[PDB]
């Protein structure tokens, strides 16, 4: 069982330090690889799109989720990012200036889109919800 | 449980309630003390002394008849063994085992038992070093240990 001697404070503290590492959340949060991800501990990241691509959807579904290959101005990563509205992809055009944010699930692929972790939230300095809602055209 | 086996025996000697000696024990403490020293200088350890009295001379417990333990009479008369009872006998058993093993090199069981016996020797010897019943330098050298005993 546990060690419960009145003098075992050293053993218990060392043991918790040692055993918190098996916890996935602690390991992910302190291992330092979050600074080796594309955003590197950032919420959003402005990037330049290379091309509107479009990608397959997973087994139970069947569709073409319209994403884009974007380059990060900050550290040069090239990644894939979704465009979250109906027919919204048209607003995006090659080599435009977009803001890329996490797509949910905290850096983990979401839903039926295969291996994509990112969403477009701005383009050419105009709100993309506003583009969808004709509030302001770029 | 036995400290070097998973045996769990509880066989032992259960001491009688009355600390005072029984009626029929009427030999005097001085004569019992002379019996102690006679057999001690004849060369027997406290275990043999107690057994001898309990068998031939009808002395139930020497503490009961005298108020002082065998070793204490022997320590007061300066006949006490230089190396304690149980450390002596653990050393003698280690000498026997090692002498057998030096000729029987394939005896892995005897090698294990020797590991255990020397472990017991060293645990007990640390106790005797802490209670100052052994010299503060007495170290169990496996080489020249057979001179010490037997």
């Amino acid at each position: 069982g546990k060690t419960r001697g009145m003098g075992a404070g050293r053993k218990l503290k060392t043991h918790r330090r040692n055993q918190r590492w098996a916890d996935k959340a602690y390991k992910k949060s302190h291992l330092g690889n979050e600074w080796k991800k594309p955003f590197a501990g950032s919420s959003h990241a402005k990037g330049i799109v290379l091309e509107k691509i479009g990608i397959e959807a997973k087994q139970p579904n069947s569709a073409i989720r319209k994403c884009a290959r974007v380059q990060l101005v900050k550290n040069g990563k090239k990644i894939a990012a979704f465009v979250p509205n109906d027919g919204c992809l048209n607003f995006i055009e090659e080599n435009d200036e977009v803001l890329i944010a996490g797509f949910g699930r905290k850096g983990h692929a979401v839903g039926d889109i295969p291996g994509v972790r990112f969403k477009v939230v701005k383009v050419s300095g105009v709100s993309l919800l506003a583009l969808f809602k004709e509030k302001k055209e770029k | 449980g036995r400290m070097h086996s998973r045996g769990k025996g509880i066989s032992s000697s259960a001491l009688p309630y009355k600390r005072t000696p029984p009626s029929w024990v009427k030999t005097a403490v001085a004569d019992v003390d002379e019996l102690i020293t006679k057999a001690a200088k004849k060369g027997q350890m406290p275990s043999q002394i107690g057994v001898l009295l309990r068998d031939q001379h009808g002395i139930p417990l020497v503490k009961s008849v005298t108020g002082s333990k065998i070793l204490r009479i022997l320590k007061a008369h300066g006949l006490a063994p230089e190396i304690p009872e149980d450390l002596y006998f653990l050393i003698k058993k280690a000498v026997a085992i090692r002498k057998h093993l030096e000729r029987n090199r394939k005896d892995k069981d005897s090698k294990f038992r020797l590991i255990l016996v020397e472990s017991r020797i060293h645990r007990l010897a640390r106790y005797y070093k802490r209670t100052k019943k052994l010299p503060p330098t007495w170290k169990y050298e496996s080489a020249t240990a057979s001179t010490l005993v037997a």
Partner: protein, 128 residues
């Protein structure tokens, strides 16, 4: 090894939970009998024998079925008389009954006694 005042209380819980009339205890202690004095003072067990012929000792208590649980907190705590207040809630069933027995420089005594004499100490255990 033995660390009694647990070997006594767990025997008492087992005897009570089985409904036995008397339970006997193989080692004793001044601390053990001072704990049983707290139980008997607060009216949870009735009178008892302390067999002290010659050895560690032996005890026989008669259970009245009025006890419900009794334990030892080996890993005996430090305990101020300002902060029993969150041991009584942490261990005892409620704020009306149940007693936490803490050894203090005035001998073994329960936590309500410790409030009024305003002396703290080490947890020996509890019963409720």
């Amino acid at each position: 090894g033995r660390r009694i005042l647990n070997d006594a209380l767990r025997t008492m819980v087992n005897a009570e939970r089985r409904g036995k009339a008397t339970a006997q205890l193989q080692p004793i202690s001044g601390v053990m009998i001072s704990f049983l004095n707290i139980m008997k003072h607060r009216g949870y067990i009735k009178n008892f024998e302390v067999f002290d012929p010659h050895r560690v000792g032996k005890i026989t208590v008669e259970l009245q079925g009025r006890i419900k649980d009794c334990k030892a907190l080996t890993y005996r705590q430090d305990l101020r008389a300002t902060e029993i207040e969150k041991y009584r809630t942490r261990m005892l069933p409620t704020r009306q009954w149940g007693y936490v027995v803490v050894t203090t420089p005035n001998g073994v005594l329960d936590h309500e006694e410790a409030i009024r004499q305003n002396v703290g100490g080490q947890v020996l255990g509890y019963f409720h």
